Amino acid sequence: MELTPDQQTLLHFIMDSYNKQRMPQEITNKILKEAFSAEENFLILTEMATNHVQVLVEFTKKLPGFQTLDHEDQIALLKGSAVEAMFLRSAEIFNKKLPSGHSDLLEARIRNSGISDEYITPMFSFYKSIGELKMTQEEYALLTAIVILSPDRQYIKDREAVEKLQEPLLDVLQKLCKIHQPENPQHFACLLGRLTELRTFNHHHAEMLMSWKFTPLLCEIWD
Amino acid sequence: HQLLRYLLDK
Numbered sequence: 001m002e003l004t005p006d007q008q009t010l011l012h013f014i015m016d017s018y019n020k021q022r023m024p025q026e027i028t029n030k031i032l033k034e035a036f037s038a039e040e041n042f043l044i045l046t047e048m049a050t051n052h053v054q055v056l057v058e059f060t061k062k063l064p065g066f067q068t069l070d071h072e073d074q075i076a077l078l079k080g081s082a083v084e085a086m087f088l089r090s091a092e093i094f095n096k097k098l099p100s101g102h103s104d105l106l107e108a109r110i111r112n113s114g115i116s117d118e119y120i121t122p123m124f125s126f127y128k129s130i131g132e133l134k135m136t137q138e139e140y141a142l143l144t145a146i147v148i149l150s151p152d153r154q155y156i157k158d159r160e161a162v163e164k165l166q167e168p169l170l171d172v173l174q175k176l177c178k179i180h181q182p183e184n185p186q187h188f189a190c191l192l193g194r195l196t197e198l199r200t201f202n203h204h205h206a207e208m209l210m211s212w213k214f215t216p217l218l219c220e221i222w223d
Numbered sequence: 224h225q226l227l228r229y230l231l232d233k
């Protein structure tokens with residue numbers, strides 16, 4: 001059994017928008033080149049997060065059906081999913097993109113930025129548990145779409161119109177698990193577990209927030 | 224959400 005023509009179409013639009021994500025080498029160089037200290041490190045990491053939110057808005061606008069939602073719900077979806085989507089995207093990069101030595105400097109900055117090991121430890125435990133699953137790009141992109149179109153964020157008006165956009169993504173993802181990794185019949189359930197594990201980062205992030213500065217885009221999206 | 228909505232409408 002295979003994706004229907006309409007699921008192939010849906011998967012194609014998601015994949016094309018996911019692949020056009022890029023972070024500027026201008027930022028990436030700062031990881032390599034700027035001075036090292038708790039304040040500088042937090043500043044650089046805050047710049048990377050600011051860029052991932054911009055990439056995220058561009059990704060999200062091209063999701064099939066998103067630009068038919070009401071504007072207020074569009075904002076509500078972005079605010080509720082930002083942290084989770086950043087971590088999913090960064091997970092993909094640690095496990096597939098970044099070599100051992102530059103992941104090392106990035107992590108050194110993260111661990112030397114004035115953030116609690118309460119945050120840092122589950123974060124790196126998430127990265128390694130996600131890297132174990134050996135997800136395809138298609139799985140990362142659908143999962144990210146499914147995180148974003150989550151109908152039970154606070155403050156959404158029309159929850160059903162969001163439900164109607166998420167459920168076909170869920171169906172595509174389960175089909176994809178049977179075709180891409182049919183040697184593990186429970187692959188879909190493992191992806192689900194990462195959905196719930198991602199949700200815990202909202203908790204740690206809210207505690208990092210209370211302790212404290214940021215960019216205007218981050219101030220809007222997190223209040 | 225001035226900056227967010229600006230990025231949404233581009």
Ligand SMILES: C[C@H](CCC(=O)Nc1cc(C(=O)O)cc(C(=O)O)c1)[C@H]1CC[C@H]2[C@@H]3CC[C@@H]4C[C@H](O)CC[C@]4(C)[C@H]3CC[C@]12C
Nearest residue numbers: 021022023028045046048049086087089090093106110115
């Ligand atoms: C470092 C990592 C981004 C890594 C990444 O995405 N790299 C990359 C590299 C390359 C490349 O070299 O080619 C290409 C690409 C490409 O997308 O193409 C991408 C970011 C993502 C989320 C960030 C946290 C958010 C919460 C919080 C916000 C606070 O403000 C600061 C502290 C906190 C905990 C942040 C810390 C640092 C984090 C983990």
